[PDB]
Design an enzyme around this catalytic site. Structure first.
Site, PDB file in Angstrom:
ATOM      1  CG  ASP A 194      -0.046  -3.775   2.906  1.00 29.51           C
ATOM      2  OD1 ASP A 194       0.375  -3.341   1.795  1.00 29.51           O
ATOM      3  OD2 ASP A 194      -0.234  -3.049   3.922  1.00 29.51           O
TER       4      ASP A 194
ATOM      5  CB  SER B  18       2.632   2.084   6.358  1.00 36.29           C
ATOM      6  OG  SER B  18       1.459   2.389   7.155  1.00 36.29           O
ATOM      7  N   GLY B  19       5.090   0.043   6.195  1.00 36.64           N
ATOM      8  CA  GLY B  19       6.059  -0.499   5.301  1.00 36.64           C
ATOM      9  C   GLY B  19       7.307  -0.762   6.100  1.00 36.64           C
TER      10      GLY B  19
ATOM     11  N   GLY C 169       2.402   6.634   8.730  1.00 36.35           N
ATOM     12  CA  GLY C 169       3.763   7.047   8.396  1.00 36.35           C
ATOM     13  C   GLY C 169       4.805   6.015   8.836  1.00 36.35           C
TER      14      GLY C 169
ATOM     15  CG  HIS D 199      -0.550   0.586   2.415  1.00 33.35           C
ATOM     16  ND1 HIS D 199      -0.103  -0.193   3.455  1.00 33.35           N
ATOM     17  CD2 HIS D 199      -0.526   1.862   2.865  1.00 33.35           C
ATOM     18  CE1 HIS D 199       0.223   0.581   4.472  1.00 33.35           C
ATOM     19  NE2 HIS D 199      -0.022   1.833   4.140  1.00 33.35           N
TER      20      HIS D 199
HETATM   21  N1  3YH Z   1      -2.521   1.432  14.334  1.00 28.13           N
HETATM   22  C1  3YH Z   1      -1.585   1.085  13.439  1.00 28.13           C
HETATM   23  N2  3YH Z   1      -0.628   0.225  13.759  1.00 28.13           N
HETATM   24  C2  3YH Z   1      -1.569   1.694  12.194  1.00 28.13           C
HETATM   25  C3  3YH Z   1      -0.559   1.464  11.256  1.00 28.13           C
HETATM   26  C4  3YH Z   1      -0.563   2.099  10.017  1.00 28.13           C
HETATM   27  C5  3YH Z   1      -1.585   2.987   9.710  1.00 28.13           C
HETATM   28  C6  3YH Z   1      -2.593   3.197  10.648  1.00 28.13           C
HETATM   29  C7  3YH Z   1      -3.613   4.085  10.408  1.00 28.13           C
HETATM   30  N3  3YH Z   1      -3.587   5.322  10.863  1.00 28.13           N
HETATM   31  O1  3YH Z   1      -4.753   5.948  10.438  1.00 28.13           O
HETATM   32  C8  3YH Z   1      -5.483   5.004   9.719  1.00 28.13           C
HETATM   33  C9  3YH Z   1      -4.798   3.863   9.697  1.00 28.13           C
HETATM   34  C10 3YH Z   1      -5.284   2.564   9.010  1.00 28.13           C
HETATM   35  O2  3YH Z   1      -4.518   1.618   8.769  1.00 28.13           O
HETATM   36  N4  3YH Z   1      -6.586   2.496   8.724  1.00 28.13           N
HETATM   37  C11 3YH Z   1      -7.020   1.372   8.113  1.00 28.13           C
HETATM   38  C12 3YH Z   1      -7.886   0.523   8.807  1.00 28.13           C
HETATM   39  C13 3YH Z   1      -8.343  -0.640   8.207  1.00 28.13           C
HETATM   40  C14 3YH Z   1      -7.955  -0.982   6.898  1.00 28.13           C
HETATM   41  C15 3YH Z   1      -8.442  -2.203   6.380  1.00 28.13           C
HETATM   42  C16 3YH Z   1      -7.991  -3.339   7.047  1.00 28.13           C
HETATM   43  C17 3YH Z   1      -8.410  -4.616   6.666  1.00 28.13           C
HETATM   44  C18 3YH Z   1      -9.300  -4.772   5.603  1.00 28.13           C
HETATM   45  C19 3YH Z   1      -9.767  -3.647   4.927  1.00 28.13           C
HETATM   46  C20 3YH Z   1      -9.350  -2.368   5.310  1.00 28.13           C
HETATM   47  S1  3YH Z   1     -10.052  -1.065   4.365  1.00 28.13           S
HETATM   48  N5  3YH Z   1      -9.158  -0.740   3.021  1.00 28.13           N
HETATM   49  O3  3YH Z   1     -11.375  -1.570   3.914  1.00 28.13           O
HETATM   50  O4  3YH Z   1     -10.246   0.150   5.220  1.00 28.13           O
HETATM   51  C21 3YH Z   1      -7.071  -0.128   6.207  1.00 28.13           C
HETATM   52  C22 3YH Z   1      -6.608   1.036   6.813  1.00 28.13           C
HETATM   53  C23 3YH Z   1      -2.580   2.562  11.883  1.00 28.13           C
END
Ligand code: 3YH
Ligand code: CA
Length: 223
Positions: free
Chosen positions: A84, A177-178, A175, A40
Site C-alpha cells: 500500500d 491515510s498516505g 483521512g 489506496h
Molecule cells: N485506525 C487507523 N489507523 C486507520 C487508518 C486509516 C483508515 C482507517 C479506517 N477508518 O475507517 C476504516 C478504516 C480502515 O482502514 N478499514 C479497513 C480495515 C481493514 C482493511 C483491510 C486490511 C487488511 C486486509 C484487507 C483489508 S479489506 N480491503 O479486506 O477490508 C482495509 C480497511 C483506520
C-alpha cells in the site's frame, strides 16, 4: 488522528495534503518533485498541497502543485492491502524552505518500541466524527510483530507494521491515510489502515517503507 494534539503551523514541513477538490489523503515529500503516499489513495488529477496548516483557510505558506503522475506500486493489491504505497510526481518542483521540506527514507527498518510521529487531517473523534482545520500529531510506538498479529483477523503481511496503543484512544484514522510515520527523523510508515480507529486491541497498521527504498529510488530515477 484520534487522541492527538495540534502540531503547530508548519512544524511538520514534509506533511503534504492530497486534494481532489477537497482534502482526502496525506503524503510525505521525499524530494522537491516526489511525494510518497498510499496506493489506496490513488486518484487521477490530484493537486498536492505543501506548507498547509489550516487546510480550509489560505494562510500564506501554501504551495498548490498538480500531480504529474501517480505511480502505485505494481504489486499493490487493493483487496488484501499488501504493498500500500504510491509515488506522486509533481508537474513542477516545489520550492523548498523552512515550512516545506523533504523527509529522509530509512536506511534500515525501525525496531519495536521506537516512538514515532504520525500526522494528518483525518478524523479526530473518539466515537462519531469530526475533521480538523489544522494539522494533528500523534506520538506512538511501533508495536511488535507478535503483538500486531494477534491484534487482527484481517491478514497482516510483512509489508505492514502496527503502531499505537493497545488500549485504544490514540490512533491514526480516516483521512490520515498516505500520511507519514516518522521515526528518528526517517520516514518509516505510511498511514494505511486500521479496524475502525483508536479502538481497544485494534492498533493502526502502516506500510513498512523500509522494504521499498530501492523501488522508490529506481522509480524516481526512471521517471
Ligand atoms: N485506525 C487507523 N489507523 C486507520 C487508518 C486509516 C483508515 C482507517 C479506517 N477508518 O475507517 C476504516 C478504516 C480502515 O482502514 N478499514 C479497513 C480495515 C481493514 C482493511 C483491510 C486490511 C487488511 C486486509 C484487507 C483489508 S479489506 N480491503 O479486506 O477490508 C482495509 C480497511 C483506520
Ligand atoms: Ca491553508
Amino acid at each position: 488522528i484520534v487522541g492527538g494534539y495540534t502540531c503547530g503551523a508548519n512544524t511538520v514541513p514534509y506533511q503534504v495534503s492530497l486534494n481532489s477538490g477537497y482534502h482526502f489523503c496525506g503524503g510525505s515529500l521525499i524530494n522537491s518533485q516526489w511525494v510518497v503516499s498510499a496506493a489506496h489513495c490513488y486518484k487521477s488529477g490530484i493537486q498536492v498541497r505543501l506548507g498547509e496548516d489550516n487546510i480550509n483557510v489560505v494562510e500564506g505558506n501554501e504551495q498548490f502543485i498538480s500531480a504529474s503522475k501517480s505511480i502505485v506500486h505494481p504489486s499493490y493489491n487493493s483487496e488484501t492491502y499488501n504493498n500500500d504505497i504510491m509515488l506522486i510526481k509533481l508537474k513542477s518542483a516545489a520550492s523548498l524552505n523552512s515550512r516545506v521540506a523533504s523527509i529522509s527514507l530509512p536506511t534500515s527498518c525501525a525496531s519495536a518500541g521506537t516512538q514515532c510521529l504520525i500526522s494528518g487531517w483525518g478524523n479526530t473523534k473518539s466515537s462519531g466524527t469530526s475533521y480538523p482545520d489544522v494539522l494533528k500529531c500523534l506520538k506512538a510506538p511501533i508495536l511488535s510483530d507478535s503483538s500486531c498479529k494477534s491484534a487482527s483477523s484481517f491478514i497482516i503481511t510483512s509489508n505492514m507494521f502496527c503502531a499505537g496503543y493497545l488500549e485504544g484512544g490514540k490512533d491514526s484514522c480516516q483521512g490520515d491515510s498516505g500520511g507519514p510515520v516518522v521515526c528518528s527523523g526517517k520516514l518509516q510508515g505510511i498511514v494505511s489502515w486500521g479496524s475502525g480507529c483508536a479502538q481497544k486491541n485494534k492498533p493502526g497498521f502502516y506500510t513498512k517503507v523500509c522494504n521499498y527504498v530501492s523501488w522508490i529510488k529506481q522509480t524516481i530515477a526512471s521517471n
